[PDB]
Amino acid sequence: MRTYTFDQVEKAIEQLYPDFTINTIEISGEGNDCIAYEINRDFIFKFPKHSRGSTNLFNEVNILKRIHNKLPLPIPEVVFTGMPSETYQMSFAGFTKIKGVPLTPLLLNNLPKQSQNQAAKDLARFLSELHSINISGFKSNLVLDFREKINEDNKKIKKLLSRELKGPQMKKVDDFYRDILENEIYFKYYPCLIHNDFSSDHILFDTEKNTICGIIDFGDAAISDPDNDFISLMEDDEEYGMEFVSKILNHYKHKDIPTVLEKYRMKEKYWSFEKIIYGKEYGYMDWYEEGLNEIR
């Protein structure tokens, strides 16, 4: 719920960093957890809007520190960290802004083929190293409980849609949740640290060298199913699509590609239900209506 002025942001930074001269400050973005501020064209500072976002920022900071210099592509470095508050575990953090432009599907597709192949290999090596790190170092509550997430989603969906969908439609919803919850494929995986939002918007590219030069936004990173980091790239409309992701999967030497595709299929279908939930939780009536239609 919380809001900040520029004056508050600067005062909080000065308290802990009194010889950091801020020359420029602007808002580069806002998500559900945090507002982001670009400082001196050099750093992204995130300030949480609520207790949960603060906790997520704290975890993101600790993740980044632990994997600093462990990975084969540049990633944001935590250069400034704030302090715990009355309800906020991390009042703010400041990260280097790595150089580069998003590797959009459009840009990738116009690359020389050799460059494209290399881009796949470089993504594969990065996911490989990321997924290899032992989870022993990380807060045990970073381990996502996907079963409970689905059950909680099932409940919210029933509350939002019970007293709406008729007999045949609600049967499809119940059928769909049941088939998910009985398929141990979605739950029975070896968890590892994953980026958790591994999409073309977060893969930076150097147009001079034609090579991927950073991975950014670890804001959702957690311990979860390594397959999730391939599935978030597979969608043809807005991501890289099946053909390219298969090159990445092969360079990473995945042993069970069919299970990757099964999880992708369930996720594409699942999105319809996430648009009802978030559509309702955030007031996006286009999502709610679209999800509603796709369900029926």
Side-chain angles (χ1 to χ4, degrees), residues 25-44:
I25 180 179
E26 295 137 337
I27 293 178
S28 67
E30 172 181 357
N32 307 292
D33 290 1
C34 283
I35 305 165
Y37 300 86
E38 172 163 343
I39 293 190
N40 290 343
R41 307 303 285 182
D42 288 336
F43 302 102
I44 306 296

Side-chain angles (χ1 to χ4, degrees), residues 49-68:
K49 293 194 277 176
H50 41 61
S51 191
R52 192 180 51 254
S54 197
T55 291
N56 289 350
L57 178 70
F58 173 81
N59 289 332
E60 177 180 4
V61 166
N62 295 149
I63 290 171
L64 286 166
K65 288 177 175 206
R66 178 54 46 81
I67 63 170
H68 178 63

Side-chain angles (χ1 to χ4, degrees), residues 127-138 140-158 160-162 164-165 167-266:
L127 295 178
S128 202
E129 286 287 301
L130 178 71
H131 303 170
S132 277
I133 297 158
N134 189 279
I135 68 174
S136 283
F138 298 103
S140 55
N141 41 60
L142 295 169
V143 172
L144 302 188
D145 173 2
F146 187 43
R147 208 186 301 275
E148 198 47 30
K149 177 266 204 279
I150 292 303
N151 283 324
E152 285 166 3
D153 287 351
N154 206 357
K155 288 187 193 194
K156 279 182 201 166
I157 282 299
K158 293 295 247 174
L160 292 167
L161 300 184
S162 267
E164 293 217 306
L165 307 163
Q169 290 131 37
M170 189 58 77
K171 198 199 177 303
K172 303 205 211 71
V173 169
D174 297 316
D175 283 347
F176 173 70
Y177 276 95
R178 182 178 45 256
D179 293 344
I180 287 178
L181 295 168
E182 296 180 333
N183 195 340
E184 280 313 288
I185 223 77
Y186 310 118
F187 308 108
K188 194 190 156 196
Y189 51 83
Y190 302 100
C192 67
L193 175 71
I194 66 163
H195 181 278
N196 209 28
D197 200 10
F198 195 67
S199 70
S200 59
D201 290 331
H202 306 144
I203 301 160
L204 297 181
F205 199 70
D206 167 8
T207 34
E208 202 275 7
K209 293 169 175 170
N210 277 358
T211 57
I212 287 166
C213 62
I215 301 303
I216 55 168
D217 205 341
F218 285 67
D220 288 350
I223 294 156
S224 201
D225 183 344
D227 295 344
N228 295 347
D229 281 347
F230 302 99
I231 302 295
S232 48
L233 287 177
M234 279 174 186
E235 198 277 298
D236 282 279
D237 274 30
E238 273 168 300
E239 298 295 349
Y240 301 138
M242 279 313 315
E243 274 218 357
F244 187 73
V245 177
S246 304
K247 299 176 163 173
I248 305 173
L249 287 151
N250 281 124
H251 291 304
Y252 173 102
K253 280 157 191 48
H254 200 287
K255 305 304 168 158
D256 186 9
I257 287 190
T259 285
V260 181
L261 303 175
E262 188 172 350
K263 301 178 170 166
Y264 164 81
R265 288 195 300 274
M266 191 282 260

